Design a protein around this ligand. Structure first.
Ligand code: A1CDN
Ligand code: A1CDN
Lengths: 38, 153
């Protein structure tokens, strides 16, 4: 039995840390909602 | 029922376990299907019943139809509002990449958080939720990339 607990407002943070790259990927999405690489 | 980001918890396992995250907006709770498998949810002494969902999109809404309709502009940085298990909410800014599919392009964020972070919202600069984090793929070098998964309003 699952339950929910509030964790915060949904807001943009002006001085957030910036990270992560920006990959361009060919993918397929199957009937089960799972992504795979092509 | 206040707007905002919520943890999705279960006690059916040892202690209390965070299975995911979701977004309350306009009286509707939004999360990824794989987090709840479409089960009912408790909020305090109240109950949230599923209203819409779709395994292929990997999304589910509770108490009403899917309300989130903002979309990545394809150009600008976004923020993941990561709510990791046992940890405070934190904003992470990134320029999305792109999932290219036979049915068109989807934004994707190259950020790796525990599975229980699934359902955390991705935001544009206006604070609008452009999709949810947690349905993705592992790329050649072993790292994880999440689609920016958005429903239809
Ligand atoms: C455990 O299942 C998972 C986990 C992550 C994402 C998806 C599923 C199923 N469809 C998308
Ligand atoms: C605690 O597990 C991990 C593992 C990888 C990345 C992150 C965490 C937590 N936040 C970022």
């Amino acid at each position: 039995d699952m339950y929910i607990e509030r964790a915060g407002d949904i807001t943009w943070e002006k001085d957030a840390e910036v990270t992560g790259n920006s990959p361009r990927l060919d993918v397929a999405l199957d009937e089960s909602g799972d992504f795979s690489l092509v | 029922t206040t707007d905002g980001v919520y943890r999705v918890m279960t006690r059916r396992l040892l202690g209390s376990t965070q299975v995911g995250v979701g977004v309350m907006q306009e009286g509707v709770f939004h999360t990824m299907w794989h987090v709840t498998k479409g089960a009912a949810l408790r909020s305090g002494e109240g109950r949230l019943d599923p209203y819409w969902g779709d395994v292929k999109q990997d999304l589910v809404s509770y108490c009403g139809p899917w309300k989130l309709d903002a979309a990545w502009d394809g150009l600008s940085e976004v923020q993941l509002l990561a709510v990791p298990p046992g940890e405070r909410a934190k904003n992470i800014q990134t320029l999305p990449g792109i999932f290219k599919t036979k049915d068109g392009d989807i934004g994707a964020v190259a950020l790796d958080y525990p599975a229980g972070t699934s359902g955390s919202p991705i935001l544009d600069k206006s604070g609008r939720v452009i999709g949810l984090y947690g349905n993705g793929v592992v790329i050649k070098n072993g790292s994880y990339v999440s689609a920016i998964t958005q429903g239809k309003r």
